[PDB]
Design a protein around this motif. Structure first.
Motif, mmCIF file in Angstrom:
data_model
loop_
_atom_site.group_PDB
_atom_site.id
_atom_site.type_symbol
_atom_site.label_atom_id
_atom_site.label_comp_id
_atom_site.label_asym_id
_atom_site.label_seq_id
_atom_site.Cartn_x
_atom_site.Cartn_y
_atom_site.Cartn_z
ATOM 1 N N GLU A 243 -6.933 123.122 105.131
ATOM 2 C CA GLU A 243 -7.744 121.922 105.059
ATOM 3 C C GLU A 243 -8.122 121.495 106.427
ATOM 4 N N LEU A 244 -9.251 121.347 106.387
ATOM 5 C CA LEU A 244 -10.117 121.049 107.663
ATOM 6 C C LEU A 244 -9.497 119.608 108.214
ATOM 7 N N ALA A 245 -9.000 118.864 107.276
ATOM 8 C CA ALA A 245 -8.532 117.488 108.026
ATOM 9 C C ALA A 245 -6.995 117.712 108.500
ATOM 10 N N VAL A 246 -6.406 118.595 108.051
ATOM 11 C CA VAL A 246 -5.114 119.193 108.538
ATOM 12 C C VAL A 246 -5.369 119.782 109.999
ATOM 13 N N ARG A 247 -6.401 120.695 110.175
ATOM 14 C CA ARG A 247 -6.523 121.338 111.404
ATOM 15 C C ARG A 247 -7.194 120.487 112.531
ATOM 16 N N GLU A 248 -8.119 119.477 112.127
ATOM 17 C CA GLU A 248 -8.376 118.393 112.988
ATOM 18 C C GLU A 248 -6.977 117.572 113.434
ATOM 19 N N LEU B 33 -17.046 126.930 115.107
ATOM 20 C CA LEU B 33 -15.762 127.417 115.324
ATOM 21 C C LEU B 33 -14.855 125.954 115.930
ATOM 22 N N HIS B 34 -15.618 125.298 116.868
ATOM 23 C CA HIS B 34 -15.054 123.855 117.430
ATOM 24 C C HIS B 34 -14.944 123.068 116.313
ATOM 25 N N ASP B 35 -16.063 122.738 115.700
ATOM 26 C CA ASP B 35 -16.128 121.639 114.506
ATOM 27 C C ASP B 35 -15.069 121.947 113.219
ATOM 28 N N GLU B 36 -15.114 123.156 113.167
ATOM 29 C CA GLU B 36 -14.072 123.479 111.850
ATOM 30 C C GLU B 36 -12.459 123.706 112.476
ATOM 31 N N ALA B 37 -12.535 123.318 113.505
ATOM 32 C CA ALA B 37 -11.101 123.389 114.025
ATOM 33 C C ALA B 37 -10.076 124.412 113.747
ATOM 34 N N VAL B 38 -10.791 125.752 114.021
ATOM 35 C CA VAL B 38 -10.120 126.952 113.775
ATOM 36 C C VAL B 38 -9.022 127.350 114.725
ATOM 37 N N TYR B 39 -9.216 126.734 116.099
ATOM 38 C CA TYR B 39 -8.183 126.854 117.143
ATOM 39 C C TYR B 39 -7.664 125.464 117.513
ATOM 40 N N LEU B 40 -6.482 125.646 118.441
ATOM 41 C CA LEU B 40 -6.152 124.603 118.945
ATOM 42 C C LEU B 40 -5.939 124.878 120.528
ATOM 43 N N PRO B 41 -6.969 124.636 121.180
ATOM 44 C CA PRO B 41 -6.816 125.196 122.768
ATOM 45 C C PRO B 41 -5.868 124.507 123.485
ATOM 46 N N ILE B 42 -5.048 125.053 124.235
ATOM 47 C CA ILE B 42 -3.898 124.314 124.738
ATOM 48 C C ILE B 42 -4.324 124.455 126.351
ATOM 49 N N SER B 43 -4.581 125.545 127.200
ATOM 50 C CA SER B 43 -4.963 125.345 128.453
ATOM 51 C C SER B 43 -5.733 126.767 128.844
ATOM 52 N N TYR B 44 -6.146 126.382 130.170
ATOM 53 C CA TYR B 44 -6.785 127.687 130.891
ATOM 54 C C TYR B 44 -5.888 128.113 131.979
ATOM 55 N N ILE B 45 -5.734 129.465 131.823
ATOM 56 C CA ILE B 45 -4.417 130.104 132.567
ATOM 57 C C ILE B 45 -5.119 130.783 133.836
ATOM 58 N N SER B 46 -4.187 130.922 134.806
ATOM 59 C CA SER B 46 -4.655 131.523 136.199
ATOM 60 C C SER B 46 -3.904 132.883 136.411
ATOM 61 N N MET B 47 -4.434 133.639 137.213
ATOM 62 C CA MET B 47 -3.731 134.652 137.813
ATOM 63 C C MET B 47 -2.572 133.947 138.811
ATOM 64 N N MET B 48 -1.581 134.744 139.014
ATOM 65 C CA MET B 48 -0.616 134.419 139.980
ATOM 66 C C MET B 48 -0.150 135.424 140.834
ATOM 67 N N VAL B 49 0.071 135.043 142.176
ATOM 68 C CA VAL B 49 0.624 136.142 143.115
ATOM 69 C C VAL B 49 1.709 135.700 143.837
ATOM 70 N N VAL B 50 2.779 136.570 143.982
ATOM 71 C CA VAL B 50 3.880 136.430 144.888
ATOM 72 C C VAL B 50 3.906 137.530 145.840
ATOM 73 N N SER B 51 3.985 137.478 146.986
ATOM 74 C CA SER B 51 3.876 138.644 147.993
ATOM 75 C C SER B 51 4.612 138.309 149.386
ATOM 76 N N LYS B 52 5.161 139.429 149.961
ATOM 77 C CA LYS B 52 5.616 139.241 151.210
ATOM 78 C C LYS B 52 4.294 138.987 152.190
ATOM 79 N N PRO B 53 4.704 137.704 153.116
ATOM 80 C CA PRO B 53 3.626 137.357 153.952
ATOM 81 C C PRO B 53 2.819 138.501 154.755
#
Ligand SMILES: O=C(O)CN(CCN(CC(=O)O)Cc1cccc(O)c1O)Cc1ccccc1O
Ligand SMILES: [Cl-]
Ligand SMILES: [Cl-]
Ligand SMILES: [Cl-]
Ligand SMILES: [Cl-]
Length: 498
Positions: A261-266, A457-477
């Motif tokens: 149901e579109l209404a449920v996805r919205e 795809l947007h108007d039909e609410a196929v997805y529930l976008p949550i976040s735009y994710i990033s690459m992460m780095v941890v390193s010895k200085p």
């Protein structure tokens, strides 16, 4: 030595067949094997193993002029014959590459001379060069390492032209790469890279704290996000967080009650305070997403209307659609059936579970009962392939896949996106338009088609976008600033310069 580094990956790099998928790890395929043309941060490709190219007026015949100074790491020549043999080997397994439309487009590949390589297509396929640039499958192993003149049934030694050579691999232990001293291009500063096999995010963090590894590089699952935030303040460590690379979202099943149901996805799309989710589960390390593709993605700056967190609106949508609350229950009913949605995820993935718990709580507040189904990886993969889900976590693919390759793949029935979209009345139109956008030479039409596909795809609410994710780095200085690769799945080890 200061020219040897140790890092970590959850699994071994696999066989390093350039032309196959799991259990081959993409970053490692990209260390050893090279493309004809190389993808750049600006969306262009540059000459790589091919120094130049031309195409026919009808856009179907392409001729590449190859470098003449390139050897595979075993001393054998890279030339047009070796390149042609690689394309044959890939296309002999054509069905496996169906997700990538270029694999359905190539009619023939011929070495016209040692330096001239001709590729003929079915149609004037616009993303041609971009798809040649991908980590796989169109990269080149020495044809001497084919098995019975194929690669689809395995390879012998993983012999590429690239700046790294695999030295040795131990299943469940480690992989070691060394610099190719006979590389055609620039010599990397690093001579040796050891990948310790460390499957658990916490133990990866511990390995860094102990000094056992020098570098961690990956997406939001690299290490626990609380730990990453703590490390970012630790003056003994170096950390980085890139600009966002791709979208994390739920995919909603339009072919299964009650998400049909579109209404449920919205309503579900108004129920989630994404900033709160990010601040709660992801330690504030990611950005809110309100569309499938971030506005910075090519062809996707469309002014699509976000569904801002608005639980009143979510409730009103459900009410209008006949989903009302019984006395004195909190879960809505329609025709005596509860508003219940199953959310499938990998049960041992702590981050997925955390997000799932938040999503469940948020949706309960608007009268939807989300049941958490945490399963092993294999079962989740099977669910996405076969559409056995109500909602699932899902991600886009980053540059240069987004948007064209991600959209292309929505037409493949045995993948999550098709399965999520299967119930839409306009699914055939969407799939027709996706085919059209890939083949059109008219830039105005191309933009219009992308607008229409993404707007539906947007108007039909196929997805529930949550976040735009990033690459992460941890390193010895001592390793210095760690660069990023243009392709989201690659790691630019050759650019690291202490
Ligand atoms: O990942 C998919 O959804 C489907 N794949 C096509 C799109 N892939 C690009 C790629 O794999 O080359 C994008 C992709 C991006 C990041 C990590 C990945 O593992 C990854 O696959 C095909 C596939 C088949 C079998 C195992 C893994 C696979 O990814
Ligand atoms: Cl497979
Ligand atoms: Cl894998
Ligand atoms: Cl050119
Ligand atoms: Cl209840």
């Amino acid at each position: 030595a200061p020219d040897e580094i140790t890092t970590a990956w959850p699994v071994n790099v696999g066989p390093l067949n350039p032309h196959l998928y799991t259990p081959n790890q993409m970053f490692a395929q990209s260390m050893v094997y090279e493309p004809l043309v190389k993808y750049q941060a600006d969306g262009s490709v540059i000459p790589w193993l091919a120094k130049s190219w031309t195409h026919s007026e009808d856009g179907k015949t392409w001729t590449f002029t190859l470098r003449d100074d390139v050897k595979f790491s075993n001393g054998e020549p890279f030339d047009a014959e070796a390149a042609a043999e690689n394309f044959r080997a890939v296309l002999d397994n054509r069905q496996r590459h169906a997700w990538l439309e270029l694999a359905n487009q190539i009619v023939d590949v011929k070495a016209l001379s040692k330096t001239e390589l001709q590729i003929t297509l079915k149609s004037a396929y616009y993303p041609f060069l971009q798809e040649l640039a991908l980590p796989r499958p169109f990269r080149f192993i020495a044809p001497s390492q084919f098995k019975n003149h194929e690669t689809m049934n395995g390879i012998k030694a993983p012999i590429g032209t690239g700046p790294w050579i695999l030295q040795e691999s131990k299943l469940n232990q480690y992989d070691v790469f060394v610099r190719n001293e006979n590389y055609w291009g620039e010599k990397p500063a690093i001579k040796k890279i050891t990948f310790n096999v460390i499957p658990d995010p916490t133990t990866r963090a511990v390995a860094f704290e102990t000094g056992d590894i020098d570098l961690l590089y990956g997406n939001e699952g690299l290490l626990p996000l609380d730990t990453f935030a703590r490390f970012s303040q630790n003056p003994a460590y170096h950390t980085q967080l890139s600009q966002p690379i791709e979208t994390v979202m739920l995919a909603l099943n339009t072919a299964k009650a009650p998400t049909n149901e579109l209404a449920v996805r919205e309503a579900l799309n108004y129920a989630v305070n994404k900033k709160s989710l990010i601040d709660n589960a992801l330690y504030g390390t990611q950005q809110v997403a309100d569309t499938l593709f971030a506005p910075s993605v090519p062809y996707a700056n469309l002014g699509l209307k976000p569904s801002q967190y608005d639980p009143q609106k979510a409730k009103a949508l459900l009410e209008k659609a006949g989903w009302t609350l019984p006395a004195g229950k909190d879960i809505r009913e329609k025709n005596g059936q509860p508003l219940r949605i199953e959310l499938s995820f990998i049960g041992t993935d702590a981050l997925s579970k955390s997000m799932a718990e938040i999503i469940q709580a948020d949706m309960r507040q608007i009268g939807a009962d989300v049941s958490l189904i945490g399963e092993e990886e294999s079962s989740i993969y099977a669910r996405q392939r076969d559409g056995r889900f109500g909602m699932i976590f899902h991600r886009t693919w980053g540059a240069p896949y987004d948007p064209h390759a991600f959209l292309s793949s929505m037409r493949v029935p045995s993948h999550a996106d098709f399965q999520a979209q299967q119930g839409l009345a306009d699914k055939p139109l969407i799939d027709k338009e996706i085919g059209e956008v890939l083949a059109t030479h008219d830039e105005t039409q191309r933009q219009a088609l992308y607008r229409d596909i993404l707007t539906r795809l947007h108007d039909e609410a196929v997805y529930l976008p949550i976040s735009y994710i990033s690459m992460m780095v941890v390193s010895k200085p001592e390793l210095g600033n760690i660069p990023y690769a243009p392709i989201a799945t690659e790691i630019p080890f050759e650019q690291i310069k202490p």
